[PDB]
Symmetry: D2
């Protein structure tokens, strides 16, 4: 009840910007990490939000993860005066960056390559659907299922289809170097719309080129990502179920099974897993969630995900504090249903599993001294059922581990492993405990007090 | 479809045109009538409509009748008073700092002063966290049952409200027997008192119901998922059919599509392995009754089930039933049961077979009863003896592979297996 | 205790021939099957022994298996006056059917192909060992490790080497047609020195050519058989650990592991398994066995073998009756150690396994109605822990099943399965019972009384 | 070599030439001296020879001393009489139809008449199936122990005969403590009375011994394998080291090669997972002592072990030990233990690790004690503290992979793992 195993991530936006210095404290006290969406964030909004986060972290001695979420590529209506669409109207799309008023301009051939007859085109976030009735060289006709106004610059998605667009997106490249002066304060970079390992690697090389030392979080947002889940999971540092986005490509009744499959796959492969968006959605307008939202959060957390990410609920909603407060409160009630076990792929895995089961058998807390976070993460993936205290001499490692299952990262300067572990045991050595360190090729050490 | 679907009839189902009523009943396995709200003649008309559909479509449906139970029947900040509230047991239960709840827990009154035949508090009647000590069955449950007793042969389940002990349940059973009912007793778990007494209460029930609305009044909003889970796990452990009722597709009272959170809630609740889910207000009085059962049924078709709590093996008929389920599962086979009482069918269902179980029976009332038990598909099959009945069931539903069975306590059990 | 699960096989010889009509009854009352060794058996000895067996079977209504054991090929010293060998003497072997006195004649090139320098040659049942010191075209020199007399016609074995000799042996072919007039009374034919599936198939085709309807029992006698165990087991009807013979090719300390491996392999593949020879060996001279022999029989039976075969103990020994009496008595004491489970290779296997575990769970006896013995055998291989009553309308099937684990075969004439099963239930239907029949492609029926 | 080898010293080992004695002691992990047969000076000379070898070869050996115990000390068909047989308890125990056994059960006498101070019967002294009621320790056990008490620091195990209750065992323990012994008490299970009381007796023993010779007198020849199995299974269940003694290579008294049946018996007995096997007559008085231990040791090198009865987990030190064994097994690693008392080493051994466990200790007496426990290879390692001792053990036997450990009750347990 008292300390959460499921980690709590909130998105920062205008609703958090205006928080009284004292409201802000009570808000950050209830999170383990923060997200900044580089779609809606100005470089000096990013800079100022991160500064407020790091300032809080210093004052309260609480390592917090900073996540930046990249926009990713998009296909948008080109230049046009607003086009008014009537229900039943046959609407024409042409490959063009500018129309003469008689059609909808779409400046990307990948839209035309993705669309077939009977596909459904989604505009206005999914509020305008158009049924495709004919296709040609660089054009499409579609029947509007309702009335609506199409504006230049609005995004276009094809229900259940992925766009074949070269990556990383030019706008992502631009956003990453704009923010590169503060790269040492960024713990996770979240990739949108990746569907192959090649896509992920490209962002990795770019982040390296630009001097970032960040974990790469891969959002599963589309049918194409779901069909390539095995390989995508294995090339990620962190996996994210992006519910809002995935809801565009699946029926609303089909989404629970897809969420389950993403979560099962990530746990199997020992990748940390998040569920994002549409958790406490009603709370944009209400200081209390609905009963169904409480059950939703409760059962999502029970599956054994590492973290839950609030988006609009905190970014733009009316009750950012109530939202994180209700998140944390629900989590304190969670009983976890025996999670998918990860695959054992080496000796170190067998060691960590044996440790976790031992601590479970003795009713013991696990303590880890970890230089880079490696053993701490290996322990976490086996889902220990109590808090795992992790001592580290690197503040950047402490921040990274803040959003990993059960981990409580503590900044502890130390000359070597043995000195580090003894400082951690001094500090957190209530009985029973199982305390370890160990690196590949070295002696692994365990101190057990029963 | 393994999880069974129950809808409540009310004003909104009454007004349905003939073709719309067919589409509605096609999407449920049983129906609930709330005796609190229905008049005797609404009860009669709704049962007649159900049995008439059942005869036309050749599909047995359970009729559940829901009893009111022994319940006790404004400005922000006001000091409000209460008086002989015709029931004494209210003033016996209430204390200082207790919360009194009104209009379904919408307005809360923190008791400032306790008196004698009175109380005062700072803004059906409930005391949060407390059970009233009212002797059972209530007078008006006796009245309601006596009044529908001429239609008793068409009542499959009688659902009891506010039980907290086996005595509550046994008393209703005696009353039903006296009035000539042959109904199963469904016990709603609605209070802290029921939850604290869960073990004994589950074991003396014929069917257990998580009544989420009523129970939500005694628990925090964030505490109720754990309680639902304990209730479901306990019923499954003791081999009792289990339903979750109310607050499933609540937003559908005003919209023909549920929220995503409601879809997830329905999905995860079904995934636990409950026998049935009961819609209440969403169909009884809501604007979109057909959309509601259409959506329940659709969500259920996507469900993948999570390995349920296994029941205790209490005897060798249990070991027999469990072995048949594991056998059928290992052969990829359907189970067929011929039964006069439904007893072997229910024993097999409690081990949660993952395919439809076809149950042949010559007793139409048994077939109606089984329609809201997990996985069971009951078919009316007249037969002179068990062997003949099983031969006819196989003849009718014997797509291979199958495991087909009958047997009663102390008799030779027969199994036919086609691989 | 009262009825054995492990079946008891005795070899008939001169010691049983002379049994008083009344001693014979008490002897056969204690066996489930009889072996006749066609090495030492004259066709009219075979005929008369079988007649006495079938006569007893009729009188006592007890189906008994008759096993005939084939001689198999051998390499024997050719024609020569006795050769006296001194310890340390360098002895010469030449390819020849007749010597001039100066060497040992061996009329089979396969001997010369099998022998290398440092091999050990075994004569006089293993009592004369010779160490090979040089080899040539069609000759060998070897140093005698002790004194001895080599006689023409004596057998020669190379320790740990197999002979490449074409099969079936001409003498086996001769013995099988000599006995072919009484072929309908022969239930098992035991093959010596097979080391490939081809060898087994050749005996199968010969037995078919000659009108036999017998199960083929394959003796594992050599290192070459042990190295080809997987395939040899899978082509057998019945497997036999021939301890005496295998003891020539392995150290005496190495034999327990080889026995275990043969038994484990046979159980895995659902082949009935016997252990033969050297069970109650001291009993040739004593009416009581040694303590070590009691432990040996006890532990061999515990492994879950279908049968134990006495050889010399009954064939030529002084106490044939005490020997079978002590065998049966020891078995009544056996507690069985959870045997190797057979592989599930079809639906019928899953059915039979499920039945056996069910009967185990209900504390029930299994009853089977079986036309050819097929389901009865499939049940037996899963090692039910109580007697399995088997009704059959074929007396030849009843005899076959007599030496299969736990089976009690009963001759029951019946028109069909359903009538057969109801006669069996009438006869053996003490509660609890699990009674079945079923053939491939048909309805399998189970009657369960709890 | 995981199963430990014990030989009895006697006339045949005494006469061994220096080089032959070295070859003999090289093939055992402990030695037994039978105080029934040895004089005090044979005891002294044989212990001195053992400790002298141990010092020269740097290998600790357990010295087991076997106590006589409270035992009571012709033509075919004759009527034989018995008289105040100096012990009364004989005539208290014997009845009509009982069998009296003489000269190791070779001749049997069926009691025809019971008298008072006498008996008559139709053809050490034993009554088949019966235990005498003689108070313990016996006078001559007190005598034998007092007489070897100056060499007590060189006695690792004292083996008790004919115990049937915890009181028998506790009494010997008090006597040993009084005389200043620090020996383990080995309890021989030798009678029906011990077997009927097996549960309590096993739990108060330091080491359990199946004495097949003595026990064979009270059971049928065909009944003894089941009894041995129950004894072994029970000791393993309660985490007690277990030996099988006598009648292992009996024919080797007169032949330098065992029978096949004896090889099988040794093999299957070792395969059950016993700590040790004890040769008695085969080495003490037989013609071929060296061949006997040479053959025991050879058979043991072929043994494949059958998954043994697992011990009860009674506390969290047990859960710790078992987890280390399973860990080492999963890593393909050797276990190293540094220990002052041998307690953690014995706790690890009872979970039956399938590799050698190297145990470092600065207490030579502990090292001698551990040499007849399953899998343990004790090394004398002087160390100032536990950390230093484990560092030295690792330095010496740290072939990777290894799981290396120390820890005492209520202290921080330390494990070092190299993968």
């Amino acid at each position: 009840r008292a300390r959460n195993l499921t980690k709590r991530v909130a998105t920062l936006g205008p609703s958090t910007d205006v928080l009284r210095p004292d409201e802000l404290i009570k808000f950050l006290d209830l999170v383990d990490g923060v997200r900044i969406n580089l779609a809606h964030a100005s470089p000096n909004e990013v800079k100022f939000r991160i500064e407020a986060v790091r300032s809080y972290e210093k004052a309260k001695n609480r390592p917090l993860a900073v996540i930046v979420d990249l926009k990713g590529p998009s296909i948008r209506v080109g230049s046009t005066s607003p086009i008014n669409v009537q229900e039943g109207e046959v609407v024409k799309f042409k490959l063009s960056d500018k129309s003469d008023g008689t059609y909808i301009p779409v400046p990307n051939k990948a839209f035309f390559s993705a669309v077939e007859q009977n596909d459904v085109i989604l505009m206005l976030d999914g509020r305008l659907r158009l049924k495709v009735t004919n296709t040609g060289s660089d054009w499409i006709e579609a029947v509007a299922e309702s009335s609506g106004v199409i504006t230049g610059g609005k995004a276009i998605v094809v229900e259940g289809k992925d766009y074949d667009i070269s990556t990383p997106a030019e706008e992502d490249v631009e956003a990453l170097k704009a923010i590169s002066p503060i790269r040492d304060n960024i713990d996770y970079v979240a990739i949108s719309l990746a569907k192959s390992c090649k896509d992920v690697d490209s962002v990795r090389s770019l982040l390296t080129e630009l001097g970032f030392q960040s974990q790469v979080a891969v959002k599963i947002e589309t049918k194409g990502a779901v069909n390539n889940l095995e390989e995508l999971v294995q090339c990620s540092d962190y996996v994210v179920v992006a519910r809002g986005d995935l809801g565009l490509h699946y029926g609303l009744d089909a989404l629970p099974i897809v969420q389950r499959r993403i979560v099962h796959t990530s746990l199997k492969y020992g990748k940390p897993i998040a569920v994002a968006t549409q958790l406490l959605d009603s709370m944009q307008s209400s200081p209390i969630p609905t009963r169904a939202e409480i059950n939703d959060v409760f059962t999502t957390a029970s599956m054994g995900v590492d973290s839950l990410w609030l988006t609009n609920e905190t970014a733009s909603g009316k009750y950012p504090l109530a939202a994180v407060s209700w998140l944390s409160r629900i989590l304190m009630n969670v009983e976890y249903q025996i999670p998918q076990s990860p695959l054992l792929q080496n000796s170190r895995d067998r060691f960590a599993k044996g440790l976790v089961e031992l601590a479970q058998d003795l009713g013991a807390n696990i303590l880890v001294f970890s230089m880079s976070g490696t053993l701490a993460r290996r322990i976490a993936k086996f889902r220990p059922r109590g808090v795992v205290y992790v001592g580290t001499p690197n503040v950047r490692v402490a921040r990274s581990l803040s959003i990993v299952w059960a981990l409580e990262p503590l900044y502890i300067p130390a000359e070597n492993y043995e000195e580090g572990l003894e400082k951690l045991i001094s500090l957190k050595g209530t009985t029973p405990f199982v305390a370890t360190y160990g690196i590949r090729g070295g002696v692994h050490s365990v101190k057990v007090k029963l």
